[PDB]
Design a protein around this nucleic acid. Structure first.
Ligand SMILES: [Mg+2]
Lengths: 549, 400
DNA sequence: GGTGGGCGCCCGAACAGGGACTG
DNA sequence: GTCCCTGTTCGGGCGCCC
């Protein structure tokens, strides 16, 4: 049926005509079954518009479908505010005495289209047999590929399930598109007979529920998983074991993996996924890299080994426990009692040229938080690979305002740390190094160097370079010609900025070394002075490096 | 028959489309609670996806109590609505009370063909339903436009209270009512409750303080101690061109080990003395321009020690501040920062009448995850997330 | 082949912002 | 103004769902 629900007004963008083209081949006829159902009416040829059409087949080949390419209409219809904000998660289901999972039948085709807009959805079959001026329908229901349908349908669904959701403030219905899951505080046969009053509700509004009525049938199927009374698991995932690999071939993988990594802990994808780096091709083959292949090896390992998830309760409490995986990667996992996982994840995002393990830890804690608020709607308690103290260190000296929430030290190696601190105070004893670099921006030739109280002076001429770079090279000379204790005086804020921030990794080879040498050092004191203002001995270095440029 | 005034947006601009962000069960639930009333009582309606626009909502526990307020982040819709003097004596009253009125604006019906911009969306814990959307039919709280339209009648309302009580200045920015008096506190509140009983139909401005730039006092100096001096001075330059560094940066002539002691010369010890005076002087050339963005920034010194400045033009600071929070074994940077920004925005409003744009010393993700927990005002200032040069921290720093 | 919407993950394009520079 | 060099937004590919 078509629903009795009031219809939803949609315009075209502020100045468009509507679509219009034609198409062409044994044109087959479901298109009259719709006629007698009200879902399309026939139209008189002073309706200007036409949109192409065609046929294919079902996403589970049981029917040999029809479809319209509103790809033109879509591009001229008003914008919407879509209303699916996210995908519900199983791990966020707090389990109810009784349950069902039913689906609406033929639902797009069950809600009316605004009539002031139906004309635009006018499509026209070629001919009954290859030529006569053919037939011409509009739609009276939500079409199967117009950008309006989903948003509008979802709204309508909601706006209908409404009186059930208050006539029962307390039976829980998870609604994703045209699919339902039902949750009841009632014993099976009052649920059973409550699920009826529901089905009958939808019917009254024009939504039928065939079977398709997942019943006394745990495992319920829902949302791509396999719910149970007490656990849940992902319908098995099979890895693209394609002995040669191209890009799209690998994206196939990582995507299965990220989907995988929501329940199978440990899943990690750093090396697969720097393979896309640089490319200009989408199909271009990619030689499986050594650390990659070795990494790829690891994942297939995990998924063999089977696992489940669990449900939630406002009763017991949420825990998140992060663990340092490899290079810039992390693996979390939320639960409520010890080895019973509730959800897990994977934060590997690389934000910055230069970072250290404590900011990645911060980001991960950030990702996991907002996400918990999304699923369970509250912030968790954490357990983190970093000693209560390292944090206070960091949170003391770092100049930006940072903050991790209610947490407690777990002892899961690798542990997080700051591979070196800078000195607050200059070093009695240490050579005091004055560094400075220059570089001609025409010639891209440069210079970096140093000058100490003990009167020492290098001056390496760099090439194909930038001013910023040389100023970081000079800090680099200084550290590698200085012994285990050293003060340095740079004129560059750019440099002072990176290093104060205490990087253990960066995109730069220069900074990655400057980090090496910083760890090897015993005490450093980095000090700044304004450039080109005649200071001792920022003056002396500054000429050293500045003749030639 | 209660009549409606047409309104619309900056020319060529379109209404907001801002994504709603994750709320907490307690925030949604409190939002679903007052949205129910808010439509029943005929103040908002419900709307489908055919409304392309959207502006975010969360919910604030405006007291220690159990009465939630809902504010809409109209910053975006605000800065697209066509707009249009300021009581100078309010900043200088013994104490000011800030009322939240507030539930007054629903009294006037918003113009229909504008309602479509007021649309917002209430999410679902774990996404168990699509979002439910509403749209205002009556001047919403938090929009530049409500206080506007309503002033007409606010002024009728206040007429006799402003007249009878001459010594008091009442001010209206957004949902807030800032009222001020030289009354002793206690005589003040009895008056402010007299206001509240009328409208049925704590700030101490004179105490706010500027933290100037200050030079290190010590009885011996190192190369290093001077280098940190010359450079700070060198920067103060751009502010007080009446500064002087040359006779002092002469001391660092050769290539001296950071730790070696320099003695200050006849002039040096007087140049520095002449400088520490110039910094007492009022910055010359600063004139609040009403049509320019007000720019506030903030640096985190340490130990609940926050410093701000507020300026429209670089180096022409209208106010340097130091805001001091807690030094704790349970301290919250974001919470503090949240508190800083609010306090600052409040002087900002009290003094100049408008609200600043903040340059926040914090990672955007970090700030966006939490600021909603620790907020308490019925407005929201525009902000961008900076990364601070750890240098310009030393400049404004304090010394024990 | 020629179908819509949603969230996620990555990555590269476009920028924005600053801070140094040239003669 | 020009360079650098950081950050950010966005759109494309895939994953998964209806
Ligand atoms: Mg230099």
């Amino acid at each position: 049926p078509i629903s009795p629900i009031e219809t939803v007004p949609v315009k075209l963008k502020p100045g468009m005509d509507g679509p219009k083209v034609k198409q062409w081949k044994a044109l087959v006829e479901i298109c009259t079954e719709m006629e007698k159902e009200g879902k399309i009416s026939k139209i008189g040829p002073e309706n200007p518009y036409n949109t192409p059409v065609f046929a294919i087949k079902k996403k589970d080949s049981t029917k040999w479908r029809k479809l319209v390419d509103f790809r033109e209409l879509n591009k001229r219809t008003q914008d919407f505010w879509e209303v699916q904000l996210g995908i519900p998660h199983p791990a966020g289901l707090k389990k109810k005495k009784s349950v069902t999972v039913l689906d609406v039948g033929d639902a797009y085709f069950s809600v009316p289209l605004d009539e002031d807009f139906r004309k635009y959805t006018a499509f026209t079959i070629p001919s009954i047999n290859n030529e006569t001026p053919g037939i011409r329908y509009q739609y009276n229901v939500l079409p199967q590929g117009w950008k309006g349908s989903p948003a509008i349908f979802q709204s309508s669904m909601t706006k209908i399930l409404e009186p059930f959701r208050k006539q029962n403030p307390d039976i829980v219905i998870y609604q994703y598109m045209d699919d339902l899951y039902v949750g009841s505080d009632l014993e099976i046969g009052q649920h059973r007979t409550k699920i009826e009053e529901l089905r009958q509700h939808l019917l009254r509004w024009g939504l039928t529920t065939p079977d398709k009525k997942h019943q006394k049938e745990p495992p319920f199927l829902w949302m791509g998983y396999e719910l149970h009374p007490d656990k849940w698991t992902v319908q098995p995932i099979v890895l693209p074991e394609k002995d040669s690999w191209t890009v799209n071939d690998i994206c196939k993988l990582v995507g299965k993996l990220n989907w995988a990594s929501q329940i199978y802990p440990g899943i990690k994808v750093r090396q697969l996924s720097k393979l896309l780096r640089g490319t200009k091709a989408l199909t271009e083959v990619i030689p499986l890299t050594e650390e990659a292949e070795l990494e790829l090896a690891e994942n297939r390992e995990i998924l063999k080994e089977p696992v489940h998830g669990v449900y939630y309760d406002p009763s017991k409490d949420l825990i998140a426990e992060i663990q340092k995986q490899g290079q810039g990667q992390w693996t979390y996992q939320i639960y409520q009692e010890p080895f019973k996982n509730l959800k897990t994840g994977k934060y590997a995002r690389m934000r910055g040229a230069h970072t250290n393990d404590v900011k990645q830890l911060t980001e991960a804690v950030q990702k996991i938080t907002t996400e918990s608020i999304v699923i369970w709607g509250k912030t968790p308690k954490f357990k983190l690979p970093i000693q209560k103290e390292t944090w206070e260190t960091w949170w003391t000296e770092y100049w930006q305002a940072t903050w991790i929430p209610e947490w407690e030290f777990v002892n899961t190696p690798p542990l997080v740390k700051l591979w070196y601190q800078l000195e607050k105070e200059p070093i009695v004893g240490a050579e005091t190094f004055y560094v400075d670099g220059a570089a001609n921006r025409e010639t891209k030739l440069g210079k970096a160097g140093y000058v100490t109280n003990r009167g020492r002076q290098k001056v390496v001429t760099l090439t194909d370079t930038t001013n910023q770079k040389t100023e970081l090279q000079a800090i680099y000379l200084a550290l590698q010609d200085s012994g285990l204790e050293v003060n340095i005086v740079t004129d560059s804020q750019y440099a002072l900025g990176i290093i104060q921030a205490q990087p253990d990794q960066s995109e730069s080879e220069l900074v990655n070394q400057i980090i090496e040498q910083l760890i090897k050092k015993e005490k450093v004191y980095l000090a700044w002075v304004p450039a080109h203002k005649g200071i001792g001995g920022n003056e002396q270095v500054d000429k050293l490096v500045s003749a030639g440029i | 028959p209660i009549e409606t005034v047409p309104v619309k947006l900056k020319p060529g601009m379109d209404g907001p489309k801002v994504k709603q962000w994750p709320l907490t069960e307690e925030k949604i639930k409190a939002l679903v609670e007052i949205c129910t009333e808010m439509e029943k009582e005929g103040k908002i309606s419900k709307i489908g996806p055919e409304n392309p626009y959207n502006t975010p909502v969360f919910a604030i526990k405006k007291k220690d109590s159990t009465k939630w307020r809902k504010l809409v982040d109209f910053r975006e819709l605000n800065k697209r609505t066509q707009d249009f003097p300021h009581p100078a004596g309010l900043k200088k009253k013994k104490s000011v009370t800030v009322l939240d009125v507030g539930d007054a604006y629903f009294s006037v019906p918003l113009d229909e063909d504008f309602r479509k911009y007021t649309a917002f969306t209430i999410p679902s814990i774990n996404n168990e339903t699509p979002g439910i959307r509403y749209q205002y039919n009556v001047l919403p709280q938090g929009w530049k436009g409500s206080p506007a339209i309503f002033q007409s009648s606010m002024t009728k309302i206040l007429e006799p209270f402003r007249k009878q009580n001459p010594d008091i200045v009442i001010y209206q920015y957004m949902d807030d009512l800032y009222v001020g008096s030289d009354l002793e506190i206690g005589q003040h509140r009895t008056k402010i409750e007299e206001l509240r009983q009328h409208l049925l139909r704590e700030l101490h401005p004179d105490k706010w303080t500027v933290q100037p730039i200050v030079l290190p006092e010590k009885d011996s100096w190192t190369v290093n101690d001077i280098q940190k001096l010359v450079g700070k001075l060198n920067w103060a330059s751009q502010i007080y061109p009446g500064i002087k560094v040359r006779q002092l940066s002469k001391l660092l002539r050769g290539t001296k080990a950071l730790t070696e002691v320099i003695p200050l010369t006849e002039e040096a010890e007087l140049e520095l003395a002449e400088n520490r005076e110039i910094l007492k002087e009022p910055v010359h050339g600063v004139y609040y321009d009403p049509s320019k963005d007000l720019i506030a920034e903030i640096q985190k010194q340490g130990q609940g020690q926050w410093t701000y400045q507020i300026y429209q033009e670089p180096f022409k600071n209208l106010k340097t501040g130091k805001y001091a929070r807690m030094r704790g074994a349970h301290t919250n940077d974001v919470k503090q920062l949240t508190e800083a920004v609010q306090k600052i925005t409040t002087e900002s409003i009290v003094i100049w009448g408008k609200t600043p744009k903040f340059k926040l010393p914090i990672q955007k993700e970090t700030w966006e995850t939490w600021w909603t927990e620790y907020w308490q005002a019925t407005w929201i200032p525009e902000w961008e997330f900076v990364n601070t040069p750890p240098l310009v921290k030393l400049w404004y720093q304090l010394e024990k």
